[PDB]
């Protein structure tokens, strides 16, 4: 007889990726703490567009 159903891969993938680029995120939206970015610079540029979904730290 033969038997041996072996083959299970555990899920593993950091939840830190720049929404804009995608490579890697270092910072995070200081308004909702959901949108990740590789740096404030990437946030400011992807902010005026992102904020269109989140409230934000300041309303102006
Ligand atoms: Zn980026
Ligand atoms: Zn946000």
From Swiss-Prot:
Chain intervals annotated as zinc finger (MYND-type): 18-54
Superkingdom assignment: Eukaryota
Family: Belongs to the CBFA2T family.
Disease with which this protein is associated in UniProt: A chromosomal aberration involving RUNX1T1 is frequently found in acute myeloid leukemia with maturation (AML-M2). Translocation t(8;21)(q22;q22) with RUNX1/AML1 that results in the production of AML1-MTG8/ETO fusion protein.
Subunit structure: Homooligomer. Homotetramerization is mediated by nervy homology region 2 (NRH2). Can interact with CBFA2T2 and CBFA2T3; heterotetramerization between members of the CBFA2T family is proposed. Interacts with TCF12, SIN3A, HDAC1, HDAC2, HDAC3, NCOR1, NCOR2. Interacts with ATN1 (via its N-terminus); the interaction enhances the transcriptional repression. Interacts (via its N-terminus) with ZBTB16; the interaction increases the transcription repression activity of ZBTB16. AML1-MTG8/ETO fusion protein interacts with CBFB.
Purpose: Transcriptional corepressor which facilitates transcriptional repression via its association with DNA-binding transcription factors and recruitment of other corepressors and histone-modifying enzymes. Can repress the expression of MMP7 in a ZBTB33-dependent manner. Can repress transactivation mediated by TCF12. Acts as a negative regulator of adipogenesis. The AML1-MTG8/ETO fusion protein frequently found in leukemic cells is involved in leukemogenesis and contributes to hematopoietic stem/progenitor cell self-renewal.
Name of this chain's protein: Protein CBFA2T1
Organism: Homo sapiens
Lineage: Eukaryota, Metazoa, Chordata, Craniata, Vertebrata
Gene: RUNX1T1
């Amino acid at each position: 007889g033969s038997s041996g159903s072996s083959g299970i891969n555990q899920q593993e993938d950091s939840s830190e990726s720049c929404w804009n680029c995608g490579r890697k995120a270092s910072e995070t939206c200081s308004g909702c703490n959901t949108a990740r970015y590789c740096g404030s610079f990437c946030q400011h540029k992807d902010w005026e567009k992102h904020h269109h979904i989140c409230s934000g730290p300041s309303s102006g």
